[PDB]
Amino acid sequence: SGTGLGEVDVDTYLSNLQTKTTLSMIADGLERSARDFDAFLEENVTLEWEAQRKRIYQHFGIK
């Protein structure tokens, strides 16, 4: 068989390839930014007062 079976055309094939590459780039950038932010927060919070920062509020505010 052949000549077309749930297939696409080259003009649309290249467009789909470019769209997929762009989406993958955006997703990778977002994931890297999120990971960098998480690492920064972990480095800044691991110094001290890990649970006290929330305990003070749980004691002040309504539990």
């Binding site: 068989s1 052949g2 696409v8 390839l17 932010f37 509020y57």
Partner: protein, 1541 residues
């Protein structure tokens, strides 16, 4: 081949002999090698072994296995029957018949002819002898050629002496002579022909008639060849008296008169010339005995002619008494005896028989109507030929004419007194009894002389060189007072003795006075007859007048002094006499002769001659002795009766329309033609011609006359149409009245009003004309098949097709710039014209769209072989298919598809087209090869038919072998296209078997054009979705791309194009640019097809062809190797500098720009007119106009080239671009659709990177068209990513590529798309490669490279951000984040300071307002990246100061921002809270006040988030809520709100 059979060997030998005969000695060694293999064949002329009974019994007993020489074959019940039938038909031995039939079966001629095997065997047996004798004939002919080298002339002679005559050469040496063998062969041929005729008459008294006719033709040709061989042998003095007596006896026993006697007469003529005349064995003792023996006969005229010839040739001895002995012999007695014998021979009809033979020899199927009834007014009593198709050759006619002129010379130089006494006796007889008609001996003899001296000026000059010789003496003596027949014969002789101009001038000077005949008496008799007719006429007077007219016409056509003298002679007044004679009551023959005389006189003329001719015509047509309007039409109707006078008048008109300058202004006729009388000028003539051609074509019974009349009418129409200026009228209507003055407008108006083109078109718009045309073109195929290439039918059809083409071309010009002007002129002035056009037929296609058999006839006429006719039919069909109204009427079901499917016309048309395109071409005659021209015409027709209306099927789909159905196609079972035998498969075959790589020249031009046209047709068929699936299926099932790649050729700057190098400056001006563009387009199409097929095969998940494709691409075939795709990337080279061009100085014409010249196409005429106007103004200024003129001229000669160069260059550029694009696309299809491992292909990736590195370095900022194509593939392959070296190379290449991207970004080159590609390339490099001494070194080097550019690049990055484009802004926003991250990775940072100095932070924070309006979607990701970048800055200690000075607290308040939609909202809130917390906690206790204010103004909202935290979408929402709570808690604990309470 080399192992050729008898038939093929003889055919090759005949071809080589014919080639050598045409001055081509490229086969001398081939002939020397062939003549040695067929020695046994040339030994015996023809000999068939007698039918043996032993072989018959052996074949009939065990017809199982046969052994012939060294080969063995198996016999079956059918082959044995065929052998027996052949042996019984030809009485041939069983072994020879079996061998012939085995040869026929091996060669496979049964399918080529589709005939029984025995008929093919008989045909081969006849062809054997045919070629075996034709070879000997050509050999003996070349052996006597005087226009060749003496060495070869003697070599062929000795070869013929050794092989044919079996006489060994002088350097060496029971057997039988050659004459008896030839005589026995001819006798056997005669007996075989007689037996064949008897058996055919018995059996007939079928499908074999044509075979019998061809066999008879071959037999008569073999007999003629044997006769010529015998004549040559006799001329070589290899005869005796025994053979002479035998031949004389055979002649005496002749029964019937046929072509055999006409073929044998040269034999006896040469015999008598050798033995009779003193030009050989001049033995007087034997001569007397031969005379007594010759002087029983079954036909007395033969004996009379033989005796007359013998006497004429024997008189050479009784001339003098010094060269021989004549003692003891009487003279007067023998003289009287010979005289009485010659008189008896004459009375018996010798000259009559000679004349009848001479006439029947040159019997032509068609004759020129200018010589009707000439030399056909005698009393012939000899029985005529049976009219069977036995045409003669050329050598036989030459020999016959030579013998006749020799006999004439002998009779004139030996028997003058005989002719004198004969003439005196005839005169006395005519005088003593005028009522009776004496014999025509002298007239017949003069006519025979005329026939002999025809087309032979070398011999005709003999009658003029020596005016005191025997020939000139008799010529001058035969011009004295005589009767009408003798004068007519002398005039006909003079006419036929004017084959050239010198002989015509000699005859003119000899006829005029310097008694004999003179022009004075001729004109006196003409005037006498004119006065007698005008105040009956006998046939003799009419014949004399016709002869005089023919002679005058011939002299005027051949000579020039006579044409210039008689035309303006005051004492003769030839024109006046012929005009007074024509207006009288006389047959049409005299009028036709007068018209032909006028044509001859007007074949070359000047302005004064034309003026005088028109004056005389008007004077004699206005009052021919009733108003002029009536007399003119009466004379027209009188001259229209018949065909001879009508055709002659049409030819005269056609000749008069030719200008004196030859084949633009000064229409070839006086502008004041008919100004005196109220007439339209020349229109009446064309009107009469057209109405005669339309209505009076039914009264012509003779088909030849009808064809000639139609051809004359078509030639007249073509001469009238070709004399019309098209571009002139266009330029006039464009700029004459709109720009130029109104002075010349009158000239163009008069030209358009007086030129008959308008009336010709008006008549062409009539139904009678197109009906007559389609009837003439509609003829049976047998006529065209049996006709000759120069037949009048083919010429008439060609002229009709040309007229149709010209009409289809000029119909628009007529309807636009002719019809309205003529209508306005008729409305303004007073003109009375009769319309002859159909208003309903708005165009020329309306009147012909109702004929469906036209296309059928045009297609059937393609199997004739005529190059011109085939090209004309193809062009006509192309123009028809290109029209719109015809295809709208056909397909408004359809009428064309059903018309070609009546009796299988489409199948035979496709078969003929396939056989034609498969025919090889002549390498030497590339541009002149008719086969190549037909191929190109067919390809252009197919291209034009497929390009127009591709969605709906057309005739091209049917011709290709498809079942044209309504809005659907298909293939039929067992059809031509299903069995891989059709036009499409033929094109595929001829393409895959085409090699362009040559050595002598290399990269030919016309093969490139052929393959380019084929690929264009293939692309048109592919792009059409209605004919795409089946085409791809048929292509992939035969490995088309594999054959194409095998036929590919690498391109390099060393290989020249047609012997010309590319670097040469003339390359841009030469034609090699066309071939280069065609090759580029071919490569582009091949790459596109390969990519499409690869994508299809990959998306179908079948490894059957995937691995094959990859193997073919890598360079291996399962092994044959081929260059990989990377090898074909050699067309990208900037060394040629196609973009750069050296601009000359151009000291003048510099201000002349190309504004109005300009799809880059600079017209040359737009600048030509400007420079012409400037030169005219410069000349009018009168300031050194003559000197500097030359300067300007050469300047033009430069700029023209310049213009063309640019055009060419432009083309090349775009061509390259196209190819590149295709290549790029292909490469993409090679990267994505590739499941093979990555580590093995890494070498190919590095090779591609190395190849593109210089391409990008050369086009980094030059052009923004190829940069996108070369950067998108780089971006793609960058995401698809011993080992130490590979990693180092990859890193080095990436670092090198990272430089040009930043360079182009800082230079702000290309469009936002190319900049986005560069941004992505740099982002994937600064994010993955850099992210450990090597790492630190790479980071420092990248930071240094970035600082090298500095703020110059950040400025552009910020400018292109938050702009018009949607993707470029996001790409720049992400690249900024990547850059700041990589910089912080290396407590301060220069990137943040640079961004702050450029006022970017300010606008970035200001844009934060109205974020809710902006917030998968592009705007969402853009805002996300923006907030991420803003948050990244709040982490550094230095950035806190700037983020605080930006005053974002008041900006985030104006926006009023404070399961998937909720998730996105919470993500935005988390981003904002993170930004705020980072900005507050970065600096320290200086921002806590703003944090407290924000927490107090937005209290409560954060409480809900902090209390909420205290399937996939749910988990994502919970994670976002947790992140928001953590961010708010961090902000609180950093601000210190607890202390505030």
């Amino acid at each position: 081949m080399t192992d050729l059979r008898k038939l093929e060997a003889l055919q090759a030998l005949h071809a080589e002999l014919v080639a050598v005969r045409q001055h081509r000695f490229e086969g001398l060694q081939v002939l020397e090698t062939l003549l040695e293999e067929q020695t046994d064949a040339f030994k015996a002329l023809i000999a068939k072994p007698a039918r043996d009974t032993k072989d018959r019994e052996a074949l009939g007993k065990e017809p199982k296995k046969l052994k012939i020489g060294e080969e063995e074959y198996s016999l079956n019940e059918d082959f044995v029957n065929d052998c027996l039938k052949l042996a019984d038909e030809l009485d041939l031995n069983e072994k020879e018949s079996a061998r012939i039939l085995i040869d026929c079966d091996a060669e496979g001629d049964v399918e080529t002819q589709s005939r029984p095997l025995w008929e093919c065997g008989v045909i081969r047996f006849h062809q054997e002898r045919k070629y075996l004798l034709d070879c000997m004939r050509l050999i003996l002919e070349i052996a006597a050629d005087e226009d060749i080298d003496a060495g070869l002339q003697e070599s062929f002679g000795v070869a013929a002496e050794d092989k044919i005559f079996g006489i060994p050469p002088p350097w060496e040496r029971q057997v039988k002579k050659f004459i008896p063998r030839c005589m026995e062969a001819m006798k056997g041929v005669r007996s075989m022909l007689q037996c064949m005729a008897d058996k055919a008459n018995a059996r007939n008294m079928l499908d074999n008639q044509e075979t019998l006719d061809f066999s008879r033709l071959s037999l008569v040709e073999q007999h003629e060849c044997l006769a010529s061989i015998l004549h040559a042998a006799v001329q070589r003095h290899h005869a005796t008296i025994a053979d002479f007596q035998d031949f004389i006896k055979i002649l005496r026993k002749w029964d019937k008169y046929d072509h055999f006697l006409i073929h044998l007469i040269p034999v006896l003529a040469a015999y008598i010339t050798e033995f009779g005349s003193p030009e050989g064995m001049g033995d007087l003792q034997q001569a007397r005995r031969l005379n007594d023996f010759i002087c029983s006969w079954a036909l007395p005229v033969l004996g009379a002619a033989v005796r007359a010839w013998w006497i004429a040739e024997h008189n050479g001895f009784y001339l003098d008494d010094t060269v021989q002995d004549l003692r003891g012999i009487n003279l007067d007695e023998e003289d009287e005896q010979r005289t009485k014998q010659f008189l008896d021979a004459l009375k018996e009809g010798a000259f009559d028989f000679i004349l009848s033979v001479a006439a029947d020899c040159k019997a032509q199927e068609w004759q020129d109507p200018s010589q009707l009834g000439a030399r056909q007014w005698l009393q012939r009593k000899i029985p005529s030929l049976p009219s069977e198709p036995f045409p003669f050759s050329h050598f036989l006619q030459h020999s016959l004419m030579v013998h006749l002129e020799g006999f004439v010379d002998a009779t004139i130089s030996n028997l003058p007194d005989v002719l004198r006494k004969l003439r005196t006796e005839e005169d006395e007889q005519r005088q003593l009894r005028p009522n009776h008609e004496q014999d025509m001996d002298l007239e017949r003899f003069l006519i025979i002389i005329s026939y002999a001296y025809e087309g032979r000026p070398d011999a005709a000059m003999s009658f003029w060189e020596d005016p005191d010789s025997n020939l000139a003496g008799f010529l001058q003596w035969a011009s004295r007072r005589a009767s009408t027949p003798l004068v007519s014969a002398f005039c006909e002789m003079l006419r036929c003795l004017a084959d050239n101009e010198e002989c015509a001038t000699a005859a003119h000077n000899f006829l005029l006075d310097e008694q004999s005949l003179t022009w004075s008496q001729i004109f006196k008799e003409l005037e006498y007859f004119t006065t007698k007719v005008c105040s009956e006429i006998e046939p003799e007077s009419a014949l004399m007048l016709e002869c005089y007219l023919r002679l005058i016409a011939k002299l005027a056509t051949e000579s020039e002094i006579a044409r210039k003298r008689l035309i303006m002679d005051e004492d003769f007044n030839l024109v006046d006499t012929i005009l007074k004679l024509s207006v009288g009551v006389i047959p049409h023959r005299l009028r036709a002769c007068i018209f032909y005389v006028l044509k001859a006189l007007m074949i070359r003329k000047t302005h004064e001659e034309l003026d005088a001719m028109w004056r005389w015509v008007e004077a004699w047509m206005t009052n021919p002795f009733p108003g002029p309007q009536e007399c003119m039409e009466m004379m027209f109707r009188e001259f229209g009766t018949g065909f001879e006078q009508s055709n002659a008048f049409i030819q005269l008109l056609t000749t008069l329309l030719v200008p004196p300058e030859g084949l633009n202004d000064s229409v070839p006729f006086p502008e004041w033609l008919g100004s005196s009388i109220r007439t339209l000028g020349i229109e009446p003539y064309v009107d009469f011609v057209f109405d005669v051609f339309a209505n009076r074509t039914k009264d012509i019974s003779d088909p030849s006359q009808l064809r000639i009349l139609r051809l004359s009418c078509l030639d007249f129409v073509m001469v009238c149409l070709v004399t019309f200026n098209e571009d002139l009228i266009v330029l006039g209507h464009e700029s004459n009245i709109s720009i130029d003055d109104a002075m010349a407008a009158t000239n163009l108006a008069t030209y358009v009003r007086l030129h008959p083109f308008s009336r010709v078109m008006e008549w062409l718009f009539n139904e009678k004309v197109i009906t007559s045309l389609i009837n003439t073109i509609h003829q049976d195929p047998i006529s065209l098949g049996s006709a000759s290439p120069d037949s009048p039918l083919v010429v008439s059809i060609l002229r009709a097709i040309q007229v149709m083409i010209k009409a289809l071309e000029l119909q628009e010009t007529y309807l636009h710039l002719v019809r309205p002007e003529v209508l306005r002129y008729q409305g303004e002035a007073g003109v009375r014209r009769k319309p002859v056009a159909n208003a309903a037929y708005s165009a020329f296609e309306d009147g012909i769209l109702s004929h469906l058999s036209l296309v059928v006839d045009l297609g059937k006429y393609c199997n004739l072989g005529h190059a011109e006719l085939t090209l004309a039919c193809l062009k006509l069909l192309e123009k028809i298919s290109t029209s719109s109204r015809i295809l709208s009427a056909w397909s408004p079901r359809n009428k064309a598809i059903v018309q070609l499917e009546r009796n299988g016309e489409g199948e035979t048309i496709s078969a003929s087209l396939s056989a034609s395109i498969m025919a090889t071409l002549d390498p030497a005659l590339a541009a002149s090869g008719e086969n190549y021209r037909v191929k190109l015409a067919i390809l252009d027709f197919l291209y034009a038919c497929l390009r127009a209306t591709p969605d709906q099927p057309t005739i091209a789909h049917q011709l290709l072998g498809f079942h044209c159905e309504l809005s659907k196609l298909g293939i039929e079972p067992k059809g031509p296209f299903d069995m891989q035998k059709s036009l499409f498969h033929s094109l595929l075959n001829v393409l895959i078997t085409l090699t362009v790589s040559e050595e002598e020249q290399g990269m030919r031009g016309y093969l490139v054009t052929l393959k380019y046209r084929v690929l264009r047709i293939l692309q048109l068929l592919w792009k059409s979705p209605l004919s795409a699936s089946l085409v791809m299926d048929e292509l992939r099932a035969t490995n088309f791309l594999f054959h194409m790649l095998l036929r590919e050729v690498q391109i390099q700057p060393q290989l020249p194009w047609d012997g010309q190098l590319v670097t040469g400056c003339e390359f841009l001006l030469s034609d090699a640019s066309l071939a280069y563009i065609d090759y580029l387009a071919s490569r582009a199409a091949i790459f596109e097809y390969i990519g499409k097929e690869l994508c299809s095969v990959s998306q179908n998940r079948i490894p059957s062809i995937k691995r094959q494709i990859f193997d073919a691409l890598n360079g291996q075939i399962f092994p044959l190797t081929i260059p990989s795709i990377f090898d074909f990337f050699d067309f990208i080279n900037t060394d040629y500098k196609w973009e750069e061009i050296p601009s000359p100085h151009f000291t003048y014409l510099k201000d002349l720009d190309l504004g109005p010249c300009i799809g880059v196409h600079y017209d040359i005429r737009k600048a030509q007119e400007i420079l012409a106007l400037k030169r005219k103004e410069y000349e009018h200024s009168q300031l050194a106009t003559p000197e500097f003129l030359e300067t300007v001229e050469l300047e033009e000669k430069v700029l023209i080239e310049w213009l063309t160069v640019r055009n060419r260059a432009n083309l090349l550029l775009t061509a390259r671009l196209n190819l590149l694009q295709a290549w790029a696309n292909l490469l993409l299809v090679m990267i994505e659709s590739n499941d093979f491992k990555s580590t093995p292909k890494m070498a190919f990736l590095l090779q591609a990177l190395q190849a593109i590195l210089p391409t990008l370095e050369a086009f980094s900022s030059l052009k923004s068209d190829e940069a996108f194509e070369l950067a998108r593939v780089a971006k793609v392959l960058l995401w698809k990513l011993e080992q130490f070296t590979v990693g180092n190379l990859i890193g080095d290449k990436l670092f090198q590529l990272f430089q040009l991207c930043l360079s182009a970004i800082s230079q702000c080159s290309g469009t936002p798309e190319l900049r986005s590609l560069y941004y992505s390339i740099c982002y994937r490099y600064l994010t993955a490669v850099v992210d450990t001494r090597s790492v630190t070194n790479a980071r420092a080097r990248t930071l240094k490279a970035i600082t090298l550019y500095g703020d110059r690049l950040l400025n552009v990055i910020c400018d292109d951000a938050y702009g018009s484009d949607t993707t470029c802004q996001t790409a720049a926003m992400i690249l900024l984040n990547a850059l700041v991250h990589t910089s912080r990775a290396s407590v301060d940072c220069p990137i943040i300071d640079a961004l702050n100095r450029l006022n970017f932070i300010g606008v970035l924070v200001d844009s934060l307002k109205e974020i809710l309006n902006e917030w998968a979607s592009p705007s969402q990701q853009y805002t996300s990246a923006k907030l991420a970048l803003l948050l990244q800055l709040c982490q550094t200690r230095q950035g806190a100061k700037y983020v605080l000075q930006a005053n974002l607290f008041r900006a985030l308040e104006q926006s009023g921002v404070f399961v998937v939609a909720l998730e996105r909202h919470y993500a935005l809130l988390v981003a904002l809270a993170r930004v705020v917390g980072a900005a507050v906690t970065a600096r320290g206790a200086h921002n806590i006040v703003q944090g407290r204010k924000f927490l107090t103004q937005h209290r409560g909202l954060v409480v809900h988030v902090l209390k909420k935290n205290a399937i996939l979408a749910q988990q994502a929402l919970e994670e976002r809520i947790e992140e928001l709570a953590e961010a708010f808690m961090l902000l609180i604990t950093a601000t210190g709100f607890l202390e505030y309470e």
